[PDB]
Amino acid sequence: SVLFISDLHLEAERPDITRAFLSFLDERARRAEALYILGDFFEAWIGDDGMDAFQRSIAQSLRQVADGGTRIYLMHGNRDFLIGKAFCREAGCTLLPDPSVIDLYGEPVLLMHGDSLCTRDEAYMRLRRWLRNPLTLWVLRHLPLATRHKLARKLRKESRAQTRMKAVDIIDVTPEEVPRVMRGHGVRTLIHGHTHRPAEHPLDIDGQPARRIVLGDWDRQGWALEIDANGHRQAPFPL
Ligand SMILES: CCCCCCCCCCC[C@@H](O)CC(=O)N[C@H]1[C@@H](OP(=O)(O)O)O[C@H](CO)[C@@H](O)[C@@H]1OC(=O)C[C@H](O)CCCCCCCCCCC
Ligand SMILES: [Mn+2]
Ligand SMILES: [Mn+2]
C-alpha cells in the first residue's frame, strides 16, 4: 500500500502532533511501500540552512523509515516551499515538484499541495507569484537567518489576519480549475491538501467520472489516505 498525508504543520510547540506523527511512522509508514507528504509538513521553513534541532529530529525520523525500504516523497506546500536537497538527503526522501503525476497501481494520479487551485483569492495568487519568483528566492536566501524568521513571522501574521476575513469559497479551490488542471495532466484522480477540508469529490471531466481526494490537516486529529491495488480509505485517528 501507499500512504498520503499533508498539512501537519509540525513545530516544536505542538508535541501532540509530533507524537501522533512518529507513532504513525512506526505503525503504518514502515509497512507501506511509499509515503507521500503533500505540503505543509512543517509550520514554516526559511531554508535548509536554518534547520533547528526539532526539524533535524523530524528528518532523522523520516530517514529511519526510508532506510527500512519505504520510499518517501515530499512535496512543497505554501508553508515549506523552501525545503531543499540538503533536507531531503538527511531525511532520505525524494523532493517531488508541484505538480507531479505518479503511477499508482497502473493509474496516472495528479498530486499537488492544492493552493495553486485557489485562483479566486487574488491577493494570495499575487503573493504566491511573488514568493516563488526566482528573484524573490534569490534575495530571500541572502537574508540572515534571524531576519528570515522575522519575515516569516510577518507573513504568518498577515496571513492569519487576512484569512479570517475571507469567505470559504475564496479560500477553497476554484471549482472549474479542478477539471481544467486534471484534464491538462490527463488524469482522472487528483490528490491534494492545503484546504484542510478532508473529503472525496466526484466530478465529470469530458463526460468521464473523476475524483479529487483532499487530505486532512492534523490540528485536532491525525489523518491518512491509504491506497492499495484493491481500494482506498482516508480516516482520522486521535493525536
Ligand atoms: C525566506 C524566509 C522568510 C520568508 C519566507 C517564509 C515562508 C514561510 C511562511 C509561510 C506564510 C504563509 O502562511 C502565507 C500563505 O501562503 N498564506 C495563505 C495560506 O494560508 P496557510 O495558513 O499558510 O495555509 O492559504 C490561505 C488559504 O488559501 C491564504 O488565505 C493565505 O494567504 C493570505 O492570507 C495572503 C494574504 O491574502 C495577503 C498577504 C500579503 C502579506 C504581505 C506582508 C508583507 C508586506 C510588507 C510591505 C511593507
Ligand atoms: Mn496547511
Ligand atoms: Mn497550505
Author numbering: 2 to 240
Copy the relevant paper text.
PaLpxH was crystallized in the presence of Mn2+ ions, which are required for enzymatic activity. Two PaLpxH molecules were present in the asymmetric unit of the P21 crystal, and all 239 amino acid residues were unambiguously determined for both molecules. Furthermore, the high-resolution electron density (1.65 Å) clearly identified a stoichiometrically bound product molecule (lipid X, 2,3-diacylglucosamine-1-phosphate) and two Mn2+ ions in each PaLpxH molecule. The lipid X molecule was likely captured in E. coli cells because no substrate molecule (UDP-2,3-diacylglucosamine) or product molecule (lipid X) was added during purification or crystallization. At the boundary between the catalytic and HI domains, invariant residues and two Mn2+ ions form a dinuclear metal center. Lipid X is positioned in a crevice between the catalytic and HI domains, with the phosphate group facing the dinuclear metal center and two acyl chains buried in the hydrophobic cavity. Six ligands [Asp8, His10, Asp41 (bridging two Mn2+ ions), His197, and two hydroxide ions (designated as W1 and W2)] are octahedrally coordinated with Mn1. In contrast, five ligands provide an incomplete octahedral coordination with Mn2: Asp41, Asn79, His114, His195, and W2 (bridging two Mn2+ ions). In the EP complex, the phosphate group of lipid X (corresponding to the beta phosphate moiety of UDP-2,3-diacylglucosamine) is strongly bound to Arg80 through a bidentate salt bridge. W1 is positioned close enough to attack the alpha phosphate of the substrate in the ES complex, as deduced from the structure of the EP complex.
